[PDB]
Enzyme design. Structure first.
Site, PDB file in Angstrom:
ATOM      1  CG  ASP A  19      -1.923   1.150   1.191  1.00 12.10           C
ATOM      2  OD1 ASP A  19      -2.078   1.788   0.128  1.00 12.10           O
ATOM      3  OD2 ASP A  19      -2.552   1.413   2.237  1.00 12.10           O
TER       4      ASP A  19
ATOM      5  CB  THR B 136      -3.332   8.225  -2.456  1.00 13.91           C
ATOM      6  OG1 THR B 136      -4.586   8.659  -1.918  1.00 13.91           O
ATOM      7  CG2 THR B 136      -2.201   8.908  -1.708  1.00 13.91           C
ATOM      8  CB  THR B 137      -0.277   5.129  -5.678  1.00 18.33           C
ATOM      9  OG1 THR B 137      -0.438   4.471  -4.415  1.00 18.33           O
ATOM     10  CG2 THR B 137       1.058   4.735  -6.281  1.00 18.33           C
TER      11      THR B 137
ATOM     12  CG  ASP C 264     -12.575   0.314  -0.738  1.00 17.94           C
ATOM     13  OD1 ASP C 264     -11.947  -0.454   0.021  1.00 17.94           O
ATOM     14  OD2 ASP C 264     -13.450  -0.087  -1.532  1.00 17.94           O
TER      15      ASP C 264
HETATM   16  N1  LIG Z   1      -8.174  -4.037 -13.750  1.00 20.98           N
HETATM   17  C1  LIG Z   1      -7.388  -3.017 -14.167  1.00 20.98           C
HETATM   18  N2  LIG Z   1      -6.901  -2.980 -15.426  1.00 20.98           N
HETATM   19  C2  LIG Z   1      -6.120  -1.973 -15.861  1.00 20.98           C
HETATM   20  N3  LIG Z   1      -5.764  -0.934 -15.086  1.00 20.98           N
HETATM   21  C3  LIG Z   1      -6.181  -0.840 -13.803  1.00 20.98           C
HETATM   22  C4  LIG Z   1      -7.037  -1.901 -13.260  1.00 20.98           C
HETATM   23  N4  LIG Z   1      -7.302  -1.566 -11.986  1.00 20.98           N
HETATM   24  C5  LIG Z   1      -6.669  -0.392 -11.729  1.00 20.98           C
HETATM   25  N5  LIG Z   1      -6.004   0.040 -12.818  1.00 20.98           N
HETATM   26  C6  LIG Z   1      -5.195   1.282 -12.919  1.00 20.98           C
HETATM   27  O1  LIG Z   1      -4.282   1.357 -11.825  1.00 20.98           O
HETATM   28  C7  LIG Z   1      -4.191   2.696 -11.338  1.00 20.98           C
HETATM   29  C8  LIG Z   1      -4.114   2.679  -9.816  1.00 20.98           C
HETATM   30  O2  LIG Z   1      -5.283   2.063  -9.282  1.00 20.98           O
HETATM   31  P1  LIG Z   1      -5.500   1.926  -7.693  1.00 20.98           P
HETATM   32  O3  LIG Z   1      -4.513   0.924  -7.142  1.00 20.98           O
HETATM   33  O4  LIG Z   1      -6.977   1.729  -7.447  1.00 20.98           O
HETATM   34  O5  LIG Z   1      -5.095   3.380  -7.138  1.00 20.98           O
HETATM   35  P2  LIG Z   1      -3.715   3.601  -6.338  1.00 20.98           P
HETATM   36  O6  LIG Z   1      -2.673   2.931  -7.198  1.00 20.98           O
HETATM   37  O7  LIG Z   1      -3.578   5.101  -6.254  1.00 20.98           O
HETATM   38  O8  LIG Z   1      -3.959   2.924  -5.011  1.00 20.98           O
HETATM   39  C9  LIG Z   1      -5.402   3.453 -11.864  1.00 20.98           C
HETATM   40  O9  LIG Z   1      -4.996   4.682 -12.473  1.00 20.98           O
HETATM   41  C10 LIG Z   1      -6.061   2.534 -12.875  1.00 20.98           C
HETATM   42  O10 LIG Z   1      -6.126   3.148 -14.166  1.00 20.98           O
END
Ligand SMILES: Nc1ncnc2c1ncn2[C@@H]1O[C@H](COP(=O)(O)OP(=O)(O)O)[C@@H](O)[C@H]1O
Ligand SMILES: Nc1ncnc2c1ncn2[C@@H]1O[C@H](COP(=O)(O)OP(=O)(O)O)[C@@H](O)[C@H]1O
Ligand SMILES: Nc1ncnc2c1ncn2[C@@H]1O[C@H](COP(=O)(O)OP(=O)(O)O)[C@@H](O)[C@H]1O
Lengths: 521, 523, 512, 106
Positions: free
Chosen positions: C48, C81-82, C379
């Site tokens: 995370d 946030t990432t 979330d």
């Molecule tokens: N199943 C998926 N297929 C392709 N891209 C994805 C998928 N799930 C998330 N992403 C991409 O990964 C990025 C980060 O998603 P997430 O992990 O929810 O946010 P963070 O990385 O900020 O915690 C997003 O910008 C999204 O476009």
């Protein structure tokens, strides 16, 4: 690129640090796999020595210097909690999985591609395990093969027949009519002054504190068990009073009146004794947990009662469910409905101490396995082997399916993975090949510890092919192939099932580690 | 910083790599333990200049005494020490056997591991040869005890046990220890070495010693009573003096009048407390501390036999023999905590008054060997030789079987085990053949300590044993490397001594071989 | 001591860039793990982005600003946030135009602020509305968090909980349509049951324990009372304790203690209530009247917690108990139950009304599984908050980044001046998002990212993103990776506003 | 990789000798005995010359190297490389390489 008072490993060398730790932990535990494997010592520093082959003890109790290797030790703890076996083989497969992955990662392959192959090889390997498992009925002839296979990996091939019949019979006494099983029904006792081979069963239960009066009966062939928790020693005044005295003797005279509340309750005990079969060729036993006065003990001793005092909470617990006597928290409500019953009740005298035994019960739903040995660490080693042997017979009985041992399943699954084209991704088969070669470490290590060639043994068992179900294993005495199902080598279905689930998850997560950062270290 | 340490991952525990041969390090620790005790073997054993934990200088040649003072720390060596402690149970001899033989197995096992044999193949071969040894050893039984309880018979057998612990006094001690042991063998199935309590007194020499019945104690009777058969006995470790209560009891002395009064109060307290002893009928009391001069008058006033035993362990014998316990207060009149004895009296032996507690009416099995010596060091070494002698016949209360000595059994047992090793095919022949050579380390030490060439002795033994001339052992002589028959010479060991020693020595070496890596652990 | 000159801006860049390089691989469903060496030799293998930076020690103040801005993101939005820190680090990583070209930060900041207005406009063009009335679409939208979690076995359960819960709190009549999950959607755990037993209570649940058995166990028409004052003897203006030594004065001070607590309780029971809820504590003498009245004793209820009650059952808040009029009655309430559900009491005042607030009941088999269900549901409530506040989704999987970057690169052709160079550099910084998604899967980054930009040129920019699981290209119309608009706009502003901040720093000064 | 597992080197060499004999037989099965013509030798000479030039002199040198052998290849005679002499010249570019039917002198 880092802050002061910290450190960071940016490049892929951080992954090599974790691969090197698993490779090192592999070479430590590979020498104690199987019966012919060596033993490891656990020096506590204070001066206590301990020998054991149980990988859970060599990772949980042994503290590990390397930070990365301590993670795998926590998994061996989790592996032991579910199945209770396979902790050593879990680490060897993790060490070889990460070893084979480094061969391809050095060629520029990403870790995430290899992990996706493990997930595919796991499902194929998990489906093949369903075909190899034997769902036969569990009989005494079969559980002996399971107990021997589990106990020979923890003893010197001398306590095999000793602990085998005890470990098997202890389980059969606590399951019938497809009832759920619980190993807590079996008590594990330890006693000195006898050789290691003096282990035997106890149908009843062992108690710590014995009777204290010369006129006690050394054995009671029949008696009603009276459970109690009342302190029959000197107690305070039970009524709203105090200590109204003028000297020490007057204070002592009031103690006699304070003993009237207890001394009369001793007569209530003697009353129900004479009422509930106080005739000839009969007896009566009291298991009061609290203390008993010496003068009151003289009253019950002359009546032929074998009394006990200062017992533990665990003893009263099993004594109730075994004998059925309900605990009376006050002798005012003494009645015969709360009385139990038992057969022979005697106190075997050892050289130093004594312990009370309540054997010859009908169906107490609780038994005891009495271990005997000369040393302290030897008793702990046998206690671990029995718990590993009981859990092995438990899994074979609960999970009615068993699988062959001696690496026959690993050799068969590896041949199945190699005979499996890609279905999720083209490059995923590199991880499937790494998963296949990782499974072969189990028969490889069995050939090393037995003193035979690592390559000759694995090639012979691999060459065994026929137009029929054929599963061969490593013969530790011969080295040649050996049908593990024929000779009587059987492993559990949950052990091999949890290995594939535990090996893949940890080998995956360690591969996904990109950087190693100090959180204020 | 790379490169890392080879195999060092568990609490910094040194894990010797495969090239370093971790098994060899444990063999070296057990090997070094034998060399300390190898020279203390036989009648020509070299004494050790031992320094006690209290900075006390003791000279001895006992093996168990060395290991007690020599704080063994290597756990691989502790396994053999724990085997020696187990060798002390079921038999009172063969401690150096477990040390010298186990070290010989480990010494020869390293030769096998260097060839390439696995650790399990060596373990299986030793366990097989140990079984063959237990089958060959009864055939070596040449003679046995005649079971007559005669001092001539018993003294003849004790010569071998007393020898190798105290040389020169083989003749006297064999008779003195025999007189105390034959007096209890009539008690079928009740002989105990604990019953023979050894007490030692500074005197002329060992020749001035004697044997006596009952619990003898050197400190004479403080009272003026000679003999009394009062079973009521009470031990009081508190010294006889002016009584003081556990309460405040603040005695304020200001003038010389109050001084004499409370000084006379102490006379009334001791007279009142000593009166309580006679009220219970206990005319026998044992003191742990000093004795007041006024109490001596009160001891003779009520005619109470007062005894002074300053040693604590002397009192513990009474607490465990008769039952009289040592209470902390000044003469608690508790009849419950008193003992029982059929006869008690003072006796004068060797110009020395000694108290006696014996059992005239009861059966009784207690005895005591009153030792005399000019040096407490040499006198304390004679005590340990008595225990090895008494325990030798405590074993003979079991099956009375003897075997030859002087290394005769070790060559005859090695000759027969080497035969089975030649017939038995496979890799087990190496460990079985070396198991036979491990027995050669015993007469090699017995010959080296005598100042004799070892190989010249083993060649003669294997030659005469090949001729069927059994019972031939080593001739103890500084100049003569020849041999002689041990049976006619009267040198005989115990069957159970070699049995339990060969069994525990094999298991002690196997437990070391099974170990291959020592790891530290934090709780 | 201090920093001055060009060393500051280049130093702030390396600090912000270094913090982003840590969590470059923590993006997407195939995120990579990180090893955090504790001071005691322990390890945490979390993946995370918020948890990693929280445990890492940082010396540069620029890193503290990047981390503190990320924490502010988590409070508002528990997702994306990432992406803020990675974009803020990539926007700052272009130090060629910053120092090597000797451009002033005001020239760079003017370009970064000009692009931000263009990035915001382009994201609204490629957006797409959502029919929030149909819950089936919100299930596919909320599955972005439920995916790769233990609650997938009850994935539809988590949607119906979070979807309906936020709809109750959403007070659209006030115009702005504000939502408060922290206050009006208070969550409380309940031991016992399983994951399937998790539901939403249509009321306010107070975790007060049952002190005595003389309390209402089951009621069909509750009557709840509200008041802020404490039920105890009236003390003075100060906190002076009452010290007494004369026995005769005890009965006087005791009678004053009993009468005033007696009279106040008599007025509370005049309305015949079922439970007395007070903001302050309730002493022992005061509870003796509650158990005598056969009513439940409740205390320690905050202001907002009490405000929701008056909307639920219709009670009325009063300063003291003496002024309790007949209006303070919880008529119409569903039921009052203080049952011990799972070795823990729980006060239920549920009803058939939606008083702009609710309470989520987290049932489960153990505390480990309860906490897993808890953090996974928060979330989902926030995604429902972001969609219901602005029902417009944008194509994910790196499509919105490449779609926006093509707009700036085509718009920079008409940008006469030196600002075109940093204006285009911001567009190339957005490509880092699919650069990490492709790096994690293991596919070739240059080959796919090159073809990915060509698809946006020819084909429509609303689709043709990247598949993080497979690694190949895929249309977001065919794969439901649609993310909200408010999360991306705030993610784009916070990255530019953060980069504009650290670029405006030119002297790290010490002083207080 | 296998020697670290305790395998002797001599055992590995026996596997190479067995695979080598099988590997040679595989060539006899897949070898194409196509008759030598201009197009076939162009692909062969292109396959060799492209690995030593910048892919620009390949098409230039290919037709020259092919025709040089064909000029000397006839009557089923063994081809001798001494029949083709190689001469160098400066003052011109690299792509001007061409064949000379006869000799060239300094
Ligand atoms: N199943 C998926 N297929 C392709 N891209 C994805 C998928 N799930 C998330 N992403 C991409 O990964 C990025 C980060 O998603 P997430 O992990 O929810 O946010 P963070 O990385 O900020 O915690 C997003 O910008 C999204 O476009
Ligand atoms: N006659 C026997 N023959 C061959 N292999 C055996 C035998 N008994 C046990 N094994 C092998 O020893 C391995 C380790 O067994 P065990 O000690 O129960 O698990 P662990 O070593 O993981 O604690 C198993 O994988 C099994 O195949
Ligand atoms: N006077 C002797 N002559 C020949 N051999 C002897 C003599 N005394 C002892 N031995 C031999 O020495 C061995 C060791 O004797 P002892 O010292 O009693 O046991 P340990 O050495 O184990 O303490 C015996 O096996 C015996 O055969």
């Amino acid at each position: 690129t880092l802050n002061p008072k910290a450190e960071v490993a940016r490049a892929q060398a951080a992954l090599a640090v974790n691969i090197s730790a698993a490779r090192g932990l592999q070479d430590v535990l590979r020498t104690n796999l199987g019966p012919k494997g060596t033993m490891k010592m656990l020096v506590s520093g204070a001066g206590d020595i301990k020998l054991t082959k149980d990988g859970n003890v060599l990772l949980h109790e042994m503290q590990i210097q390397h930070p990365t290797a301590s993670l795998i030790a926590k998994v061996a703890t989790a592996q032991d909690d579910i199945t209770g076996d396979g902790t050593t083989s879990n680490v060897l497969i993790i060490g070889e999985l990460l070893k084979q992955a480094d061969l391809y990662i050095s060629e520029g392959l990403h870790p995430r591609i290899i992990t996706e192959g493990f997930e595919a090889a796991k499902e194929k390997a998990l489906q093949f395990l369903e075909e190899v498992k034997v769902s036969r009925e569990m009989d005494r002839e079969t559980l002996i093969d399971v107990a021997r296979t589990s106990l020979r990996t923890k003893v010197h091939a001398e306590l095999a027949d000793v602990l085998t019949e005890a470990v098997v019979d202890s389980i059969l006494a606590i399951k019938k009519q497809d009832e759920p099983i619980d190993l807590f029904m079996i008590e594990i006792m330890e006693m000195k002054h006898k050789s290691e081979t003096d282990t035997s069963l106890i149908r009843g239960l062992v108690l710590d504190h014995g009777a204290r009066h010369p006129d006690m009966k050394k054995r009671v062939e029949d008696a009603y068990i009276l459970t109690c928790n009342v302190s029959l020693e000197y107690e305070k005044t039970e009524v709203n009073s105090g200590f109204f005295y003028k000297s020490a003797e007057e204070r002592e005279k009031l103690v006699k009146a304070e003993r009237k509340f207890i001394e009369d309750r001793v007569k209530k005990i003697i009353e129900l004794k004479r009422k509930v079969c106080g005739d000839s060729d009969k007896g009566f036993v009291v298991i009061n947990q609290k203390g008993i006065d010496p003068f009151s003990l003289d009253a019950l001793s002359k009546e032929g009662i074998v009394a006990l005092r200062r017992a533990k909470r665990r003893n009263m617990e099993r004594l109730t469910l075994a004998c059925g006597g309900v605990a009376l928290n006050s002798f005012d409500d003494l009645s015969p409905d709360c009385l139990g019953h038992a057969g022979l009740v005697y106190e075997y005298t050892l050289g130093e101490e004594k312990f009370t035994f309540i054997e010859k019960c009908n169906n107490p739903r609780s038994v005891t396995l009495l271990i005997k040995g000369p040393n302290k660490h030897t008793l702990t080693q046998i206690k671990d082997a029995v718990r590993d042997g009981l859990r092995a017979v438990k899994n074979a009985i609960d999970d009615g399916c068993v699988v062959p041992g001696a690496g026959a399943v690993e050799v068969a699954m590896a041949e199945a993975l190699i005979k499996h084209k890609p279905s999720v991704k083209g490059r995923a088969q590199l991880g499937v090949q790494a998963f296949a070669d990782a499974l072969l470490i189990i028969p490889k290590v069995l050939a090393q510890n037995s003193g035979f060639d690592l390559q000759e043994t694995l090639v012979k068992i691999q060459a065994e092919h026929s137009e029929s179900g054929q599963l061969v294993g490593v013969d530790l005495n011969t080295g040649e192939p050996m049908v593990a199902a024929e000779v009587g080598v059987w492993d559990n279905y949950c052990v091999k099932k949890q290995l594939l689930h535990s090996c893949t998850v940890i080998a995956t997560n360690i591969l996904l580690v990109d950087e190693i950062m100090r959180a204020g270290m | 910083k790379a490169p890392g340490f080879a195999q060092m991952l568990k609490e910094g525990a040194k894990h010797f790599s495969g090239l370093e041969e971790a098994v060899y390090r444990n063999i070296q620790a057990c090997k070094e333990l034998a060399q300390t005790t190898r020279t203390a073997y036989g009648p020509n054993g070299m004494n050790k200049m031992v320094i006690n934990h209290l900075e006390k200088l003791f000279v001895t040649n006992d093996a168990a005494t060395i290991l007690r003072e020599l704080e063994v720390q290597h756990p691989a060596a502790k396994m053999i020490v724990m085997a020696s402690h187990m060798q002390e149970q079921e038999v009172g001899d063969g401690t150096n056997f477990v040390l010298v033989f186990a070290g010989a197995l480990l010494e020869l096992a390293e030769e096998l591991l260097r060839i390439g044999l696995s650790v399990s193949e060596v373990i299986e071969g030793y366990e097989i040869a140990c079984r063959k040894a237990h089958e060959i050893l009864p055939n070596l039984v040449c003679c046995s005890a005649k079971n007559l309880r005669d001092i001539d018979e018993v003294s003849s057998l004790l010569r071998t046990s007393i020898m190798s612990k105290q040389y020169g006094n083989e003749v006297f001690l064999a008779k003195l220890i025999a007189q105390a042991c034959v007096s209890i063998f009539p008690d079928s199935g009740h002989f105990n070495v604990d019953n023979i309590r050894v007490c030692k007194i500074l005197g002329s020499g060992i020749s001035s010693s004697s044997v006596l019945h009952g619990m003898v104690f050197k400190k004479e009777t403080e009272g003026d009573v000679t003999s009394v058969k009062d079973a009521k006995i009470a031990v009081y470790s508190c010294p006889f003096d002016g009584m003081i209560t556990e309460t405040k009891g603040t005695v304020l002395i200001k003038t010389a009048e109050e001084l004499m009064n409370f000084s006379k109060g102490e006379e009334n307290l001791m007279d009142a407390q000593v009166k309580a002893i006679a009220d219970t009928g206990a005319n026998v009391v044992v003191t742990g501390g000093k004795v007041a001069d006024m109490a001596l008058h009160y001891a003779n006033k009520y005619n109470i036999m007062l005894v002074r035993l300053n040693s604590k362990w002397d009192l513990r014998r009474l607490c465990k023999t008769v039952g009289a316990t040592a209470l902390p207060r000044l003469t608690p009149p508790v009849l419950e905590e008193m003992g029982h004895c059929d006869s008690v009296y003072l006796s004068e032996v060797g110009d020395t008054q000694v108290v006696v507690f014996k059992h005239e009416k009861e059966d009784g099995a207690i005895s005591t060997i009153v030792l005399r010596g000019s040096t407490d060091n040499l006198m304390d070494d004679i005590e340990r030789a008595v225990d090895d002698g008494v325990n030798t016949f405590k074993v003979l209360t079991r099956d009375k079987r003897l075997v030859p000595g002087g290394g005769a059994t070790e060559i005859e047992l090695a000759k027969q085990i080497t035969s089975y090793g030649e017939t038995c095919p496979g890799l087990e022949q190496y460990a079985i053949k070396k198991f036979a050579e491990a027995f050669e380390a015993i007469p090699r030490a017995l010959a080296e300590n005598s100042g004799v060439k070892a190989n010249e002795v083993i060649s003669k033994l294997y030659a005469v044993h090949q001729e069927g001339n059994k019972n031939v052992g080593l001739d103890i002589e500084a100049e003569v490397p020849a041999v002689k028959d041990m049976l006619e010479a009267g040198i005989l060991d115990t069957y159970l001594g070699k049995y339990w020693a060969i069994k525990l020595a094999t298991n002690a070496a196997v437990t070391v071989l099974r170990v291959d890596q020592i790891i530290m652990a934090k709780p | 001591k201090r920093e001055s000159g060009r060393k500051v801006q280049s130093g702030n860049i390396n600090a912000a860039k270094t913090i982003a390089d840590i969590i470059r691989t923590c993006l997407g469903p195939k995120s990579m793990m990180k090893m955090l060496l504790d001071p005691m030799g322990g390890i945490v293998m979390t993946n995370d982005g918020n948890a990693i930076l929280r445990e890492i020690q940082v010396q540069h103040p620029a890193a503290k600003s990047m981390i503190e801005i990320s924490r502010t993101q988590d409070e508002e939005v528990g997702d994306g946030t990432t992406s803020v820190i990675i974009l803020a680090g990539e926007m700052l990583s272009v130090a060629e135009h910053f120092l090597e070209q000797q451009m002033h930060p005001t020239v760079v900041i003017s370009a970064y602020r000009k692009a931000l207005d263009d990035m915001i406009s382009t994201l609204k063009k490629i957006s797409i509305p959502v029919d929030i009335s149909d819950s089936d679409m919100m299930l596919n939208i909320i599955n972005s968090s439920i995916t790769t979690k233990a609650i997938s076995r009850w994935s539809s359960l988590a949607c119906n909980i979070a979807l309906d819960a936020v709809k109750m709190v959403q007070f659209e009549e006030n115009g702005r349509k504000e939502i408060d999950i922290k206050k009006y959607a208070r969550v409380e755990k309940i031991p016992g049951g399983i994951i399937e037993d998790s539901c939403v209570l249509r009321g306010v649940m107070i975790n007060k324990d049952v002190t005595h058995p003389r309390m209402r166990r089951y009621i069909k028409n509750p009557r709840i009372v509200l008041l802020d004052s404490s039920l105890e003897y009236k003390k003075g203006e100060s906190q002076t304790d009452i010290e007494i030594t004369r026995e005769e004065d005890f009965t006087r001070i005791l009678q004053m203690e009993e009468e005033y607590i007696q009279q106040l309780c008599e007025d509370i029971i005049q309305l015949k209530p079922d439970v007395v809820i007070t903001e302050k504590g309730i002493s022992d003498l005061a509870q003796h009247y509650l158990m005598r009245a056969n009513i439940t004793a409740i205390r320690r209820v905050r202001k907002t917690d009490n405000n929701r009650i008056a909307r639920a059952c219709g009670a009325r808040i009063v300063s003291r108990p003496e002024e309790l009029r007949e209006d303070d009655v919880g008529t119409g309430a569903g039921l009052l139950e203080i049952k011990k559900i799972g070795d823990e009491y729980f006060t239920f005042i549920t009803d058939c009304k939606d008083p702009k607030a609710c309470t989520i009941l987290l049932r489960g088999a153990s505390k480990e599984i309860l906490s897993e269900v808890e953090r996974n549901l928060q979330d989902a409530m926030q995604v429902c908050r972001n969609v219901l506040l602005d029902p417009q989704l944008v194509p994910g999987g790196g499509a919105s980044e490449m779609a926006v970057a093509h707009a700036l690169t085509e718009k920079s052709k008409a940008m006469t001046g030196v600002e075109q160079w940093p204006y285009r550099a911001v567009a190339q910084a957005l490509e880092v998002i699919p650069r990490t998604l492709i790096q994690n899967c293991g596919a070739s980054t240059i080959r796919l990212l090159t073809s990915l930009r060509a698809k946006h040129t020819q084909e429509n920019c609303e689709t043709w993103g990247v598949n993080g699981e497979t690694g190949t290209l895929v249309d977001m119309k065919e794969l439901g990776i649609w993310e909200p608009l408010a999360v991306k706009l705030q993610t784009y502003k916070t990255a530019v506003e953060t980069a504009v901040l650290l670029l405006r720093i030119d002297d790290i000064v010490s002083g207080h």
